Amino acid sequence: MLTYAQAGVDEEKTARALREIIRTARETFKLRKGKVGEPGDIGHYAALLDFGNFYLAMTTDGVGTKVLVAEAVGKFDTIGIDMIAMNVNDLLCVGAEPLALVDYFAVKEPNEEVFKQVAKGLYKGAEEAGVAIVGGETAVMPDLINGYDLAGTAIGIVEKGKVITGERIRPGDSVIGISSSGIHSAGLTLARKLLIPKYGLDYEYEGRKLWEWLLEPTRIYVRPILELINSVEVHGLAHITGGGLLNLKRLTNYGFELEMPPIEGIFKLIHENGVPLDEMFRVFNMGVGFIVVVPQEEKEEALEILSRHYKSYELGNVTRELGKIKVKNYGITL
Amino acid sequence: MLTYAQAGVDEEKTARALREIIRTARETFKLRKGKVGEPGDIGHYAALLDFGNFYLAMTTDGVGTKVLVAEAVGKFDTIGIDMIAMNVNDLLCVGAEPLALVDYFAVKEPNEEVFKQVAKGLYKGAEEAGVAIVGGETAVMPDLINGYDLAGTAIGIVEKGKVITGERIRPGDSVIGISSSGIHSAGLTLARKLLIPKYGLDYEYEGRKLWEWLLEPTRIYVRPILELINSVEVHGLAHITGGGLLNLKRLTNYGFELEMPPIEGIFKLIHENGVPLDEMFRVFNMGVGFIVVVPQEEKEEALEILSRHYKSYELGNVTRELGKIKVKNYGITL
Numbered sequence: 320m321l322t323y324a325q326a327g328v329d330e331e332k333t334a335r336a337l338r339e340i341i342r343t344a345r346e347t348f349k350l351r352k353g354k355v356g357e358p359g360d361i362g363h364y365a366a367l368l369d370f371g372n373f374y375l376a377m378t379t380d381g382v383g384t385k386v387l388v389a390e391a392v393g394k395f396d397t398i399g400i401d402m403i404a405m406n407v408n409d410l411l412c413v414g415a416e417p418l419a420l421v422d423y424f425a426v427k428e429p430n431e432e433v434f435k436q437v438a439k440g441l442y443k444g445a446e447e448a449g450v451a452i453v454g455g456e457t458a459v460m461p462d463l464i465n466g467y468d469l470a471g472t473a474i475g476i477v478e479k480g481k482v483i484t485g486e487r488i489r490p491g492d493s494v495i496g497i498s499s500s501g502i503h504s505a506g507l508t509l510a511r512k513l514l515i516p517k518y519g520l521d522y523e524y525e526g527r528k529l530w531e532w533l534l535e536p537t538r539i540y541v542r543p544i545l546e547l548i549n550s551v552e553v554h555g556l557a558h559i560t561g562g563g564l565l566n567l568k569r570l571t572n573y574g575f576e577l578e579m580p581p582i583e584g585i586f587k588l589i590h591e592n593g594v595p596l597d598e599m600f601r602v603f604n605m606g607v608g609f610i611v612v613v614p615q616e617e618k619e620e621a622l623e624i625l626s627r628h629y630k631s632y633e634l635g636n637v638t639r640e641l642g643k644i645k646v647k648n649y650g651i652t653l
Numbered sequence: 654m655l656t657y658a659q660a661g662v663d664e665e666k667t668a669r670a671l672r673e674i675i676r677t678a679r680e681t682f683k684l685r686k687g688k689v690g691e692p693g694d695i696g697h698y699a700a701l702l703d704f705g706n707f708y709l710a711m712t713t714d715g716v717g718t719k720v721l722v723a724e725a726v727g728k729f730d731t732i733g734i735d736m737i738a739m740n741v742n743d744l745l746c747v748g749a750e751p752l753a754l755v756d757y758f759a760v761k762e763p764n765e766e767v768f769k770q771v772a773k774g775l776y777k778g779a780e781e782a783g784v785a786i787v788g789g790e791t792a793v794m795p796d797l798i799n800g801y802d803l804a805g806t807a808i809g810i811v812e813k814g815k816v817i818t819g820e821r822i823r824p825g826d827s828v829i830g831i832s833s834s835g836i837h838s839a840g841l842t843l844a845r846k847l848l849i850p851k852y853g854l855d856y857e858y859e860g861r862k863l864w865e866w867l868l869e870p871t872r873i874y875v876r877p878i879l880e881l882i883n884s885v886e887v888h889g890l891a892h893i894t895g896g897g898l899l900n901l902k903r904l905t906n907y908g909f910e911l912e913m914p915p916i917e918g919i920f921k922l923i924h925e926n927g928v929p930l931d932e933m934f935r936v937f938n939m940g941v942g943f944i945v946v947v948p949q950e951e952k953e954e955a956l957e958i959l960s961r962h963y964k965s966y967e968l969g970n971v972t973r974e975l976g977k978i979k980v981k982n983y984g985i986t987l
């Protein structure tokens with residue numbers, strides 16, 4: 320087909336349905352007014368709860384339908400990495416250090432093989448993120464779940480005065496992208512429906528099977544970002560998840576002028592199957608898993624720090640074209 | 654369908670499948686050794702995380718297949734109460750005061766009317782529990798979810814020295830039960846599969862339709878328990894969820910000698926349809942939604958405090974004899 324909506328995930332409809340839940344949530348903030356745990360507003364990558372000298376950051380994230388690929392090939396060995404990565408990467412975007420995670424595992428059956436595989440990736444992700452897995456919930460629910468749905472909730476800590484929300488972003492700031500490991504965990508419904516029936520899961524593309532491209536575990540950005548924020552002045556941090564580059568608009572009203580990396584790997588296969596390029600930058604990470612915004616004079620030091628850990632790119636600059644994201648080398652405006 | 658396992662939920666097989674996940678989680682504890690967020694052990698109602706002067710308690714709970722009844726009859730405005738109740742009631746069982754919650758909503762479709770109803774119950778539960786809903790996650794996943802699955806994660810706070818785990822439970826202690834509002838959110842898979850085909854959700858039993866029996870929202874115990882633990886010495890706290898009375902074995906290895914309330918309402922219908930009483934006490938709450946263990950000299954004041962909130966019962970005593978839960982007035986030993 321063409322779009323994420325036609326694949327079954329209508330982001331516009333989802334936002335419409337969610338307005339009532341978000342309004343209700345905001346009404347509950349007053350229940351902790353002036354007390355420990357008093358929250359900030361909803362809409363950012365994590366909630367910030369006032370504990371006096373510090374904020375606790377709290378976020379919740381699932382893997383999505385990536386688990387349907389894992390099931391077909393009997394490899395849940397890295398789905399736990401995906402779940403941990405999505406949660407801890409979101410914590411970083413308020414400037415918090417990730418501490419602990421609980422997982423929610425909703426399954427059609429208590430399959431011992433699936434669970435042993437899930438456990439392997441949970442450890443690898445936890446070790447790379449520096450977090451303890453401290454508890455969880457397992458729900459065997461075959462009438463409600465057609466596979467093995469893995470989600471979780473993570474908490475982190477950020478000192479008062481060191482929160483990074485994006486309000487410090489100014490025009491002229493440099494925009495830097497850290498490469499993704501691949502598709503990560505966003506847009507799998509479109510990728511699965513577009514490619515699997517046409518090509519088959521065993522289709523071989525640049526020496527890897529389609530399932531390998533679809534299952535590649537999400538990259539964890541904790542070490543480079545925690546190093547970065549303790550060395551250079553950071554104005555904004557954005558984990559590229561659902562919404563793609565639109566996630567930058569959660570940080571600032573200022574505009575962005577970007578040059579994005581070449582379209583490669585699975586993203587090229589998807590593009591060559593008719594998804595419009597503007598939709599692609601709103602759905603897939605397109606090679607950039609994480610974006611940082613720093614003062615222009617810190618650009619080279621930031622790149623030196625990030626490049627120790629992962630391939631990183633100077634993407635562009637913040638502008639006064641309020642509310643616009645110009646992908647200059649593709650002629651796209653979001 | 655005369656046991657929970659025959660209805661599709663085999664707790665033995667779930668525990669077996671979870672072994673590698675629990676083992677891996679414990680191997681991650683060392684990642685926070687001596688740092689902020691260092692955890693206690695897994696196994697209890699909540700995780701305890703060391704923040705210096707206090708512990709942060711964290712738990713995650715879903716509603717279960719109760720949501721399939723809500724969808725069948727079109728009544729979603731109380732499952733938000735169930736979700737909040739499950740989470741905050743578990744936080745109470747380490748002695749913590751609930752502070753904040755995030756919700757995970759995995760849905761077949763973004764239906765605006767469903768979301769509007771869910772939002773009503775979310776507010777009602779949050780106000781009664783005294784918590785803010787500070788964020789969440791919404792996943793539209795029709796290939797994976799056959800309904801509207803609602804879960805959440807809650808955090809609470811407990812001062813060092815005031816944690817209530819059950820280790821202070823001693824033989825001779827008094828065991829007090831607080832009535833449930835009904836079936837709560839445990840065992841719905843058995844109740845759905847056993848009752849709905851034969852009777853239909855419109856069947857009237859003892860003055861209420863079957864859907865009313867199955868959808869009655871889970872009771873919230875925050876106000877009575879917080880008053881209790883600030884008034885008398887409390888040795889153990891147990892929210893009666895999956896496993897029924899077996900949850901007491903998580904607090905202590907000492908035995909229990911109990912008299913349980915008469916079988917009424919939905920529990921009587923289930924029993925009359927062939928589920929034996931011994932299975933029923935390990936699946937359903939059987940009229941008791943929360944159990945407290947206090948030294949005998951606190952028993953009269955504890956009953957007075959609890960009875961001002963909900964119907965409460967002296968159930969029995971902790972025994973020097975180990976491991977056994979004797980329900981004396983039904984001739985059942987668990």
Ligand SMILES: Nc1ncnc2c1ncn2[C@@H]1O[C@H](COP(=O)(O)O)[C@@H](O)[C@H]1O
Nearest residue numbers: 340344361362363756758788789790791
């Ligand atoms: N079901 C939900 N309940 C409460 N808040 C939500 C829910 N889904 C998303 N949010 C919030 O909406 C914002 C955008 O979420 P997302 O689209 O997942 O990045 C974040 O602040 C979330 O915490």
Ligand SMILES: Nc1ncnc2c1ncn2[C@@H]1O[C@H](COP(=O)(O)O)[C@@H](O)[C@H]1O
Nearest residue numbers: 422424454455456457674695696697698
């Ligand atoms: N999927 C999971 N991951 C980690 N811990 C879990 C999981 N499921 C259950 N637990 C833990 O096992 C204990 C019993 O949980 P429950 O059977 O839900 O009462 C609690 O301490 C939970 O935190």
Ligand SMILES: O=CNCC(=O)N[C@@H]1O[C@H](COP(=O)(O)O)[C@@H](O)[C@H]1O
Nearest residue numbers: 458459714715717718839840841842
């Ligand atoms: O305890 C916390 N949340 C509730 C919970 O864990 N529910 C889980 O969902 C399955 C079905 O429950 P049912 O639909 O039969 O009631 C079952 O595995 C329960 O353990």
Ligand SMILES: O=CNCC(=O)N[C@@H]1O[C@H](COP(=O)(O)O)[C@@H](O)[C@H]1O
Nearest residue numbers: 380381383384505506507508792793
């Ligand atoms: O961001 C946190 N977790 C990821 C996430 O939000 N996943 C959600 O699941 C749906 C499909 O995802 P897909 O299977 O197409 O990737 C979609 O509604 C996403 O928002």
